[PDB]
Design an enzyme around this catalytic site. Structure first.
Site, PDB file in Angstrom:
ATOM      1  N   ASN B  45      47.277  31.261  -5.661  1.00  0.00           N
ATOM      2  CA  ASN B  45      46.554  32.438  -6.129  1.00  0.00           C
ATOM      3  C   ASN B  45      45.634  32.065  -7.292  1.00  0.00           C
ATOM      4  O   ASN B  45      46.030  31.316  -8.190  1.00  0.00           O
ATOM      5  CB  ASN B  45      47.528  33.557  -6.530  1.00  0.00           C
ATOM      6  CG  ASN B  45      46.926  34.943  -6.335  1.00  0.00           C
ATOM      7  OD1 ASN B  45      45.893  35.103  -5.666  1.00  0.00           O
ATOM      8  ND2 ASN B  45      47.546  35.950  -6.939  1.00  0.00           N
ATOM      9  N   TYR B  85      38.038  44.701 -10.368  1.00  0.00           N
ATOM     10  CA  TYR B  85      39.462  44.478 -10.542  1.00  0.00           C
ATOM     11  C   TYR B  85      39.854  44.938 -11.935  1.00  0.00           C
ATOM     12  O   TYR B  85      39.042  44.905 -12.867  1.00  0.00           O
ATOM     13  CB  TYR B  85      39.797  42.986 -10.334  1.00  0.00           C
ATOM     14  CG  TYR B  85      41.218  42.575 -10.651  1.00  0.00           C
ATOM     15  CD1 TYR B  85      42.232  42.679  -9.686  1.00  0.00           C
ATOM     16  CD2 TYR B  85      41.552  42.055 -11.906  1.00  0.00           C
ATOM     17  CE1 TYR B  85      43.546  42.285  -9.976  1.00  0.00           C
ATOM     18  CE2 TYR B  85      42.859  41.659 -12.204  1.00  0.00           C
ATOM     19  CZ  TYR B  85      43.851  41.776 -11.238  1.00  0.00           C
ATOM     20  OH  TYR B  85      45.141  41.397 -11.535  1.00  0.00           O
ATOM     21  N   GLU B  94      47.650  47.885 -10.752  1.00  0.00           N
ATOM     22  CA  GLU B  94      46.612  46.903 -10.498  1.00  0.00           C
ATOM     23  C   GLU B  94      45.664  47.522  -9.483  1.00  0.00           C
ATOM     24  O   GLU B  94      46.120  48.101  -8.496  1.00  0.00           O
ATOM     25  CB  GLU B  94      47.227  45.608  -9.964  1.00  0.00           C
ATOM     26  CG  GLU B  94      46.264  44.442  -9.771  1.00  0.00           C
ATOM     27  CD  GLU B  94      46.947  43.238  -9.121  1.00  0.00           C
ATOM     28  OE1 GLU B  94      47.741  43.443  -8.183  1.00  0.00           O
ATOM     29  OE2 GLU B  94      46.707  42.091  -9.556  1.00  0.00           O
ATOM     30  N   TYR B  96      41.665  47.607  -7.335  1.00  0.00           N
ATOM     31  CA  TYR B  96      40.643  46.838  -6.645  1.00  0.00           C
ATOM     32  C   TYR B  96      39.602  47.792  -6.073  1.00  0.00           C
ATOM     33  O   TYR B  96      39.952  48.839  -5.518  1.00  0.00           O
ATOM     34  CB  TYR B  96      41.225  46.046  -5.472  1.00  0.00           C
ATOM     35  CG  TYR B  96      42.134  44.888  -5.785  1.00  0.00           C
ATOM     36  CD1 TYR B  96      43.504  45.073  -5.951  1.00  0.00           C
ATOM     37  CD2 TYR B  96      41.632  43.600  -5.858  1.00  0.00           C
ATOM     38  CE1 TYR B  96      44.340  43.996  -6.228  1.00  0.00           C
ATOM     39  CE2 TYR B  96      42.453  42.532  -6.124  1.00  0.00           C
ATOM     40  CZ  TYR B  96      43.804  42.735  -6.311  1.00  0.00           C
ATOM     41  OH  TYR B  96      44.610  41.653  -6.571  1.00  0.00           O
ATOM     42  N   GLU B 184      38.630  36.620  -6.235  1.00  0.00           N
ATOM     43  CA  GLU B 184      40.028  36.269  -6.020  1.00  0.00           C
ATOM     44  C   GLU B 184      40.168  35.365  -4.796  1.00  0.00           C
ATOM     45  O   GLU B 184      39.484  35.555  -3.784  1.00  0.00           O
ATOM     46  CB  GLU B 184      40.896  37.521  -5.852  1.00  0.00           C
ATOM     47  CG  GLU B 184      42.347  37.188  -5.514  1.00  0.00           C
ATOM     48  CD  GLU B 184      43.321  38.305  -5.863  1.00  0.00           C
ATOM     49  OE1 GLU B 184      44.541  38.039  -5.885  1.00  0.00           O
ATOM     50  OE2 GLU B 184      42.878  39.446  -6.110  1.00  0.00           O
TER      51      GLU B 184
END
Ligand SMILES: [Ca+2]
Ligand SMILES: [Ca+2]
Ligand SMILES: [Ca+2]
Ligand SMILES: [Ca+2]
Lengths: 327, 328
Positions: B45, B85, B94, B96, B184
């Site tokens: 990641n 983000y 979180e 997006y 990402e």
């Protein structure tokens, strides 16, 4: 576009359009520190983008300042392409002039010179009598560095000029502003500032670095202990476990790089404190050694307590610390 | 290094962050403004971003309207997102707003709704992460998504529009921690060049509905405040404490204040701005001719607050003449 007096922040940069009566002007704000400007038959006009300060810190306390810029500059008359700003107590308007129009400022006899950024600057001090200022109509000193030849791109080591001025007895007050500026006087012109980066701190004071081993610092808290795997260092087990030391900071800004790890696959967090104030948190996501860097910490010059402390432990992880590097 | 390990900082006014877990490599190069280039190779990641970190004290309404204008050269090789983000806290979320992706369009599951905005269509999802890395350590938290129905790598993202869409669907948001344009990667390699990235908090003009309040229509205060007719219909403030004030109902959290005024003479006049009893800035009038001085981007919060214009720096060498105040 901006066509009358205005102060604001744009894309992180403090900008200002200022003119007195007569003629016209237009400023267009672009990304970063960049802008274009045009003016026509003005008395006085100023376009700038940089940083305004809260009048509480000297330039040493703010730290090393440097501007990297490039401009298309087409004055038609009296004009400057210049770094510009103010201090207070004393009230001072200052200039680092890299190019100009028909007249090289400021007249008078130099107090000294400085060779820096691949050029030579003559240093002058003048007086303005009952002129417009940030404190209204006032009488105040002006400090100048003026290049001996024109240039419209490069790097200006602002802090170098400040130190040069101060060694020649030109005392500076607390900073009010530093900005790349286009000025016009009794003139017309256009300019395109296509590159304008103001950097505070992190210059080539970043290639030396001081490494302080976690195992050489002072241990604190209920369980802090040395370890040898996965490296020589210490483990912080419970809240209050910490490691700390006094550090003599030569400059005002630093980056902090902590090499560490969690003991397991849960994320470990270690708080950074300077002089008892939280300045950020180091994160170690897993059991493998990693370096986590907190950049751009303003802390002021002098000897201060540095702590690395666990405050968010809940029995699911410990923190392993190898060393801390200060840049 | 040109950031090849986990790092947080500020660069050219933008909060930036490089984050990866173990495995593979990554490299981030910071450029002017919100811009950066990124490259990654065989990661588990990785996230590269530039935007703003907040102090966790304000909701997104209190921060104000948020909008991102961007353009990127985006070449993922595997699973990856080109996305706005960020995080909220209490609740920990979180989020997006995905405009492009690599081999897999996120996030799976069935949409909770749609939004048509910025000339595209986004499907809205809510998911859960269980014991995953977060800004609060390893934790369990919700994820909010808007994902475009087809890829795009430049344009405008009306962040606050998505936030309101989510909240109207019962996806409640906490105080803001971060908003940033992000690349990402998951189990992938790739490169990206974000050559334009502007985060605007407070920018207008889908209803730029400027309110002009005449100085002579406001409440006078102080020892000498009086009406005038030259150089305009307005008021004069002569001594310290002379002021004019009025209640304004602020619909949004940020405003620009444009004061038309003049000194009475060739000396520079100064007028202080107070909102809700707090000093918020100073208007400057350099000479005797009418001029507009604008203080842009003032965060003041929503609600009904007293706007005051007051002289505090008089010394008998000038008076302040005020025509009107515009709030935009
Ligand atoms: Ca523990
Ligand atoms: Ca060690
Ligand atoms: Ca007066
Ligand atoms: Ca009026």
């Amino acid at each position: 576009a901006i066509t009358s007096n205005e102060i604001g922040t744009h894309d992180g940069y403090d900008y200002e359009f200022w003119k007195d009566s007569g003629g016209s002007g237009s400023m267009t704000l672009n990304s970063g520190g960049t802008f274009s400007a045009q003016w026509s038959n003005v008395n006085n006009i100023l376009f700038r983008k940089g940083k305004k300060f809260d009048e509480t810190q000297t330039h040493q306390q703010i730290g090393n300042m440097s501007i990297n810029y490039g401009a298309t500059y087409n004055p038609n008359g009296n004009s400057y392409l210049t770094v510009y700003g103010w201090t207070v107590d004393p009230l001072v308007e200052f200039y680092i002039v890299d190019s100009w129009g028909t007249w090289r400022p400021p007249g008078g006899t130099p107090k000294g010179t400085i060779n820096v950024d691949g050029g030579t600057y003559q240093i002058y001090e003048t007086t303005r009598y009952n002129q417009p200022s940030i404190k209204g109509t006032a009488t105040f000193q002006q400090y100048w560095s003026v290049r001996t030849s024109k240039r419209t791109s490069g790097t200006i080591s602002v802090s170098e000029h400040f130190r040069a001025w101060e060694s020649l007895g030109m005392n500076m007050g607390n900073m009010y502003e530093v900005a790349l500026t286009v000025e016009g006087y009794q003139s017309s012109g256009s300019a395109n500032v296509y590159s304008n980066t103001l950097t505070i701190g992190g210059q080539s004071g970043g290639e030396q670095a001081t490494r302080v081993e976690a195992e050489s610092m002072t241990k604190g808290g209920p369980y802090t202990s040395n370890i040898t795997s996965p490296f020589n260092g210490v483990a912080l087990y419970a809240n209050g476990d910490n490691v700390s030391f006094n550090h003599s900071f030569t400059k005002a800004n630093s980056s902090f790089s902590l090499r560490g790890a969690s003991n397991n696959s849960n994320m470990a967090r270690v708080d950074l404190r300077i002089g008892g104030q939280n300045r950020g948190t180091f994160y170690f996501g897993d059991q493998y050694p990693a370096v986590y860097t907190i950049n751009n910490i303003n802390h002021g010059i002098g000897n201060q307590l540095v702590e690395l402390i666990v405050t968010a432990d809940d029995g699911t992880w410990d923190a392993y610390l190898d060393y801390l590097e200060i840049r």
